[PDB]
C-alpha cells in the first residue's frame, strides 16, 4: 500500500497515452472487426497451449490495436502482426517465454521465422518500444483488494468478462482499460454476491455506477450473448477449475442501474 496510490495514478496517465485510435478499423481497407475477433480468439488458444499469463494476452492485444491504429495491414498479414505481438508480450511479461520456434510452429508454417522476427522489429519501431502498457488485468487486480471479503468466483468472473471485451473492437475500443475493469468488477460482484461497485472504489478511481453505465450496459449484453458468440475460446478457457468454472455461471437478466 506504500505505492498503491502512486502506481494507480500513474497507470491512469499511461492508459491514456497507450490508447489505440477508436476508429481505426474503418480506416483499415482490408481487415474487419470480425477478422480481429478471430485473431484475438486464436491468441487466447495460444495462451492456453503455452500456459501464458492472462496479462500477456492483454498486452499482446494492446500492442495489436496500437499497431493497427497507424499501420494498414492486409488480411493475410494480420496473423503475422498478432504473432509478433504475442512474442513481444511474452518476452516482456513471462518468466519463461516460448521460443520463436514455437511461435513459428503455431502459425502452421503460414510464416517463416525471418518474417516473424522482422515483424517483431517493425512492431517495436511502430510502438516506439513503449511496451509497458496498462491493461484491464492490472486495474482488476487493484480493484480486487477492495472486496469485503475476497471471493474467488468474483475475481475469476471479472477476469472472464474483461477477457471477453478483448474480442470485440466494437464496442470496447472506445473504453479505457480502467473503465472496462470497473464494469467487469461491478458486473462480476453483482452476479455472484448481489453487491455493487463499492464506495471505496469510488474514492480510489472517481468512477461511479453512473460513469460506468455505458461500458456496463455494453458488457452486460456481451455477457448475455456470450454463449452464441462466434468466438468461444474464452468461455472454454474459463470452464477450468483454475478459474472456478465461472463461465458456467448464469448472467443476471437485468442490472438495475
Amino acid at each position: 500500500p506504500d505505492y498503491h496510490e502512486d502506481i494507480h495514478t500513474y497507470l491512469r496517465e499511461m492508459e491514456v497515452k497507450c490508447k489505440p485510435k477508436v476508429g481505426y478499423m474503418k480506416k483499415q481497407p482490408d481487415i474487419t472487426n470480425s477478422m480481429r475477433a478471430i485473431l484475438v480468439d486464436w491468441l487466447v488458444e495460444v495462451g492456453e497451449e503455452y500456459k501464458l499469463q492472462n496479462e500477456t494476452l492483454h498486452l499482446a492485444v494492446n500492442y495489436i490495436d496500437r499497431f493497427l491504429s497507424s499501420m494498414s495491414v492486409l488480411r493475410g498479414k494480420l496473423q503475422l502482426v498478432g504473432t509478433a505481438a504475442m512474442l513481444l508480450a511474452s518476452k516482456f511479461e513471462e518468466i519463461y517465454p516460448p521460443e520463436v520456434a514455437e511461435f513459428v510452429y503455431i502459425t502452421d508454417d503460414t510464416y517463416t521465422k525471418k518474417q516473424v522476427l522482422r515483424m517483431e522489429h517493425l512492431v517495436l519501431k511502430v510502438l516506439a518500444f513503449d511496451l509497458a502498457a496498462p491493461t484491464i488485468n492490472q486495474f482488476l487486480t487493484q480493484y480486487f483488494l477492495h472486496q469485503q471479503p475476497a471471493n474467488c468466483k468474483v475475481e475469476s468472473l471479472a477476469m472472464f468478462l474483461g477477457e471477453l471485451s478483448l474480442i470485440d473492437a466494437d464496442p470496447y475500443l472506445k473504453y479505457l482499460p480502467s473503465v472496462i475493469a470497473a464494469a467487469a468488477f461491478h458486473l462480476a460482484l453483482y452476479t455472484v454476491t448481489g453487491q455493487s461497485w463499492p464506495e471505496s472504489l469510488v474514492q480510489k478511481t472517481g468512477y461511479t455506477l453512473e460513469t460506468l453505465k455505458p461500458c456496463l450496459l455494453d458488457l452486460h449484453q456481451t455477457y448475455l450473448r456470450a454463449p452464441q458468440h462466434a468466438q468461444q475460446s474464452i468461455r472454454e478457457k474459463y470452464k477450468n477449475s483454475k478459474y472456478h468454472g465461472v463461465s458456467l455461471l448464469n448472467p443476471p437478466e437485468t442490472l438495475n442501474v
Binding site: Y10, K113, L124, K125, F129, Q138
Partner: protein, 296 residues
Amino acid sequence: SMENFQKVEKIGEGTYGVVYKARNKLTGEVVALKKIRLTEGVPSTAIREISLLKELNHPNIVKLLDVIHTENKLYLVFEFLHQDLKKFMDASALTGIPLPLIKSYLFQLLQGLAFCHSHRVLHRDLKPQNLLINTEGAIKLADFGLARAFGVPVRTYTHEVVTLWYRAPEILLGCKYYSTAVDIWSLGCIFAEMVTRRALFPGDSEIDQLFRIFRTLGTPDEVVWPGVTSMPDYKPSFPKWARQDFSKVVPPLDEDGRSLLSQMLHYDPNKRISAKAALAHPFFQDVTKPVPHLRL
C-alpha cells in the same frame, strides 16, 4: 543516427554487447553507447530495459537519450557518467568516503528508487557496480537489464534475482512473492558498504549468505518475522544466532544512521522501510551535496 557519434573508447561489457564512451560530433555531448547485437530476435532483457527506461526520467536514474534501431544492431544512447560506485570506493581507500557524501549518495539513491517503485518498476540488481557517479556530485541507478514492471498485488516473478551479496532474505528463503522491499534490502547493504568499504554479507553460496545474515541480524523466528518458519527454503535445523547489538554492525555509524540502516535491513518485507518513507528519516536532516574529485 550513428554517423553523428565518434567512439572514444570501450568502457564496459554486457551480455549482449559492449558499452562505449562516445561523443556527439555536432553538439559535443558525451554519451555511453550500449550495443546489443541481434536468433531469438530482440533479447527479453533489452525489451524490458528499453521500455522501462523510457518511462523513468529522473535526476537519479541513468538517462536513456535515444534508441538507434538498425537491422543487425540496437544502440542504446545514455547520458555519460564517469565512474561506478565500486571503482570509487576502491579508490577511496585509507581516506574513507566522508559521511556527508555517504548521506548525499544514499539520499539520491533513495529518490531514484522511490521513483522506480512509484512507477511500478523493480530494479532487482542494485549493487555498487550498477550505481554511476559524475563529477558534479550525482549518483544514479543504471543497468535495468534485470528490471521488471510489477503489478498490484505482485505475482510470483523470476526467482533468480539480485547478485547474491545484495540478495534479500525473502528471495533466499524461496518466498512465493517478493516486491519493492528487495531493492531496499540491496540499498541497505550498499549503505553499510559505503561506510565500511567492505561488503556487508559476502556469502559464497545461498546457505552461506543466509547464515551470514542470521549471524548479523539474528536468526529470524515467528516473533520477528511471522510466517518465516513455513517459508519454502526455511529449515528447522538453521542455527539460532542471537541478534547483534546493532552499533557493532557498522561501528562508525551514528544513532540516526543506525536507525535507518536497521529499518532498511528489517527481516519482514512488510515492515522494511520504503524508499519514499526513508527520505524523511532524521538521518537526512542535514544532507548536502558534496562534489568529490574523481581520479578519471
